[PDB]
Ligand binder design. Structure first.
Ligand SMILES: *[B]([O])([O])C1=[C]N(C2=[C]C(Cl)=N[C]=N2)N=[C]1
Length: 358
């Protein structure tokens, strides 16, 4: 890398790893559209395996950006509409509270208080039906945002129904393959296990456990190289050859709802650039990000704004991830770590790096 990129990345990330006691970390900076990679520490402390550019990390809720884009592609294919009722794709969902709740509301956490987690008790497809049939909204649809796996996860499951493909097969064929993300997995294959980092929670080595709607809400694993290519594709969608995927990317960065200075996309969240660093840093703390907040509809949604800070945090029990990019500047960053450390620290580091390069 250019010395300037090397210096800022090292000066920011080294103290971060020390302060947060992060075992292993990988970072990619996309600068003028080209990726530069950095790695530190251990993918597996016990076995002394270093983090490399091929190490797989659990992306946690950064997975929601893939779900958002896959749903976008399904809209662009004419398979689904965001204005369609949820019941069009799940006719057994007959309970009356669902009248008025559309795929838009599911994709954007605005259905009226679907919960952050699907209950652990829910396993089977019939367990899921019963959970959604019995769920009671706190609020009318399209009035309040409450970030929720049970919301976007159901969107991802329904979005692929008309294709007839399983969610994983759809993601593989329609998103990962066309973008050449050949080391990004919903289920890590045996051949790639040697590269799968452990996560660390309270000093214990851990991987994510199976759960309902896991693939759709938090289940993607990827390397720093593939995540850089993910950022390049979302920075410059018009260079993607597959037409519906190009559109699906653009649709996922449309602005559907506003709360404070943030806009809700499909998976992605966006703010006008230049941003107030306090606004994104403080806003990323779970005390704000997981809170129930009134939303203003953006009628109609604003198509992808190039002058935006587009981002998503992600975590699992043992991993912490962050992606941000600014289309107008051809600039972005991916940070993957195998410890779940506080969101504001991630965002502070990313802003320090991107602000210095912008
Ligand atoms: B996301 O905000 O990172 C996210 C991840 N999870 C989650 C849930 C379960 Cl049961 N297991 C791992 N991760 N929820 C939200």
């Amino acid at each position: 890398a250019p010395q300037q990129i090397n210096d800022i990345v090292h000066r920011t990330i080294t103290p971060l790893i020390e302060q947060q006691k992060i075992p292993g970390m990988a970072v990619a900076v996309i600068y003028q559209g080209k990726p530069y990679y950095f790695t530190w520490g251990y993918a597996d402390i016990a076995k002394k395996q270093p983090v490399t550019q091929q190490t797989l990390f659990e992306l946690g809720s950064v997975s929601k950006t893939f779900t958002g884009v896959l749903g976008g592609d399904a809209i662009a294919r004419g398979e689904i509409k965001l204005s369609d009722p949820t019941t069009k794709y799940w006719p057994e969902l007959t309970a009356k509270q669902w009248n008025g709740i559309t795929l838009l509301h599911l994709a954007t956490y605005t259905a009226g208080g679907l919960p952050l987690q699907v209950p652990d008790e829910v396993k089977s497809s019939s367990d899921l039906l019963r959970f959604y049939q019995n769920w009671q909204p706190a609020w009318a649809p399209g009035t309040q945002r409450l970030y929720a796996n049970s919301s976007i996860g159901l969107f991802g499951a329904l979005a692929v129904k008309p294709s007839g493909l399983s969610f994983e097969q759809a993601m593989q064929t329609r998103v990962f393959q066309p973008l050449k993300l050949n080391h990004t997995w919903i289920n890590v294959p045996p051949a790639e296990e040697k590269n799968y980092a452990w996560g660390y929670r309270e000093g214990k080595a851990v991987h994510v456990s199976p759960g309902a709607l896991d693939a759709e809400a938090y289940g993607v694993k990827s390397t720093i190289e593939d995540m850089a290519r993910w950022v390049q594709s979302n920075l410059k969608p018009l260079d993607i050859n597959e037409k519906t995927l190009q559109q699906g990317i653009q649709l996922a960065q449309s602005r559907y709802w506003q709360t404070g200075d943030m806009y809700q996309g499909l998976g992605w969240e966006m703010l006008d650039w230049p941003v107030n660093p306090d606004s994104i840093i403080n806003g990323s703390d779970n005390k704000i990000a997981l809170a129930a907040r009134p939303v203003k509809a953006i009628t109609p949604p604003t198509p992808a704004v190039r002058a935006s800070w587009v981002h998503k945090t992600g975590a699992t029990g043992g991993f912490g991830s962050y992606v941000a990019f600014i289309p107008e500047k051809e600039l972005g960053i991916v940070m993957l770590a195998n410890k779940n450390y506080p969101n504001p620290a991630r965002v502070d580091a990313a802003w320090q790096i991107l602000n210095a390069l912008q």
